[PDB]
A paper describes a structure:
One class of druggable targets is the endoplasmic reticulum (ER) resident molecular heat shock chaperone GRP78, which is also referred to as Immunoglobulin Binding Protein (BiP), an HSP70-like stress response protein implicated in the cellular unfolded protein response (UPR). GRP78 is essential in the maintenance of ER homeostasis, where it facilitates proper protein folding, mitigating physiological and pathological damages that may cause an accumulation of misfolded proteins and ER stress. GRP78 is structurally divided into two distinct domains: the nucleotide-binding domain at the amino terminus followed by a flexible linker to the substrate-binding domain at the carboxyl-terminus. ATP hydrolysis and ADP/ATP exchange within the NBD of GRP78 play an essential role in the chaperone activity.
HP3 (7-Deaza-2′-C-methyladenosine) was used to assess how chemical modification at the 2′ hydroxyl group of the ribose sugar and the deaza-modified adenine moiety (i.e., N7 to C5) affect protein-ligand interactions at the ATP binding site of pfGRP78-NBD. It is evident that HP3 interacts with pfGRP78-NBD, but lacks hydrogen bonding with Arg364 due to the deaza substitution. In other nucleoside analogue-bound pfGRP78-NBD structures, a hydrogen bond is clear present between N7 and Arg364. The 2′ methyl substituent directs the 2′ hydroxyl group to form a hydrogen bond with Lys293, but it itself is involved in hydrophobic interactions with Glu290. Similarly, the HP3-bound structure of hGRP78-NBD shows no hydrogen bonding between hArg367 and HP3 either. In the HP3-bound structure of hGRP78-NBD, the N7 deaza substituent of HP3 is not involved in hydrogen binding, similar to that of pfGRP78-NBD. In addition, the 2′ methyl substituent of HP3 helps orient the 2′ hydroxyl group to form a hydrogen bond with hLys296 and has hydrophobic interactions with hGlu293 conserved in pfGRP78-NBD. The finding that the hydrogen bonding and hydrophobic contacts are conserved and indistinguishable between the P. falciparum and the human orthologue suggest that neither the deaza modification at the N7 position nor the 2′ methylation enhance selectivity for pfGRP78-NBD.
Residue numbers in the entry: 28 to 404
The structure:
Amino acid sequence: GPVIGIDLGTTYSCVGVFKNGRVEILNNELGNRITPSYVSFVDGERKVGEAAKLEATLHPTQTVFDVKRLIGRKFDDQEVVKDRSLLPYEIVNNQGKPNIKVQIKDKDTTFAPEQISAMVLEKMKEIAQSFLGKPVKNAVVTVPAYFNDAQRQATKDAGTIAGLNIVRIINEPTAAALAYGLDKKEETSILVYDLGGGTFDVSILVIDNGVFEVYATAGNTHLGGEDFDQRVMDYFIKMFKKKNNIDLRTDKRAIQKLRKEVEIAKRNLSVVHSTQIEIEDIVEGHNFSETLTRAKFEELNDDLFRETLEPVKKVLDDAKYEKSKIDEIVLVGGSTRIPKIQQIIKEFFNGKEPNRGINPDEAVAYGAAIQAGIILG
Ligand SMILES: C[C@@]1(O)[C@H](O)[C@@H](CO)O[C@H]1n1ccc2c(N)ncnc21
Ligand SMILES: C[C@@]1(O)[C@H](O)[C@@H](CO)O[C@H]1n1ccc2c(N)ncnc21
């Protein structure tokens, strides 16, 4: 039967199939090739993906996301204590493990992280099933190289709940290397720089006669595109207050409208130098109208961009690598489209050009789908 490829990411998933010799990264019901890893439990209905993320503004305690930060961990782990302080939905201690508590028709309902991940995997499965016109029972699913056996098993368990035999778990750096078609012959050292929506990962991946090994991995679990958006939000909230005596933080709907336009502006500024951010009646009777330049975008985030170099030094240190030992730098995640990111990496590596693919946001799912093709022969 068919084997699909799923990138089960912290903020977004992505599904691809290998069909007729091509990888097809599939569109969700709204025509997006990535789907927010969100599930909402509002008013007796369950939503998954973009419809769920839209519930976050008015129902923050019922909108579950970022479960990948909890899956396979213990409630008292330093990382989970930190995530409980950040996340708005209730996290409870079920026999030493974090569970998610929401209300369904007012009733307290408690989920394991793998049960929420299963709902995201089910939606990806359904996309593939309708694209292929066939039932899907098998998948390649990706994990971070740092995932321990409990974290990988919990991910496999989410697959089983979703009706997926996970026939292979592959690490995100291997998936990226397959997507970029990196030469499997002889010995090559690759830096995989993976800057996503919520998390930053960097890995030294050695490819030797077709065998993939991650020699070192480091990162920052709270550094991504969403942080760059927040820096811009903070600046424009302050400016709007100065100019209008309105603090937009006092209206959650106003913040949601602004956040949507800021995200688009950021993406625009990866190609142009100036963009307009416009919301009619951001509150009744008051329009929002600003220009954001690429230079101000970079100024607002430059310390965050330079923070991505601390993990790169650590993995070069762990592996005992000179910078020159890296043969190829490959960029994964849509945030790697930011020109300043590319410049800072190139300068760190004394002028070595990083390899950007055309669509770094889909590279992991693309590689998962290639792995699915390889396993079938
Ligand atoms: C959608 C994103 O904001 C998100 O934060 C992340 C998910 O990988 O990727 C970003 N992303 C996606 C595309 C993109 C862009 N052209 N310029 C900056 N960031 C970009
Ligand atoms: C908010 C203000 O009532 C302020 O209190 C007053 C004195 O500076 O003038 C208005 N103000 C301040 C700045 C500003 C602006 N850029 N566009 C409209 N109104 C503006």
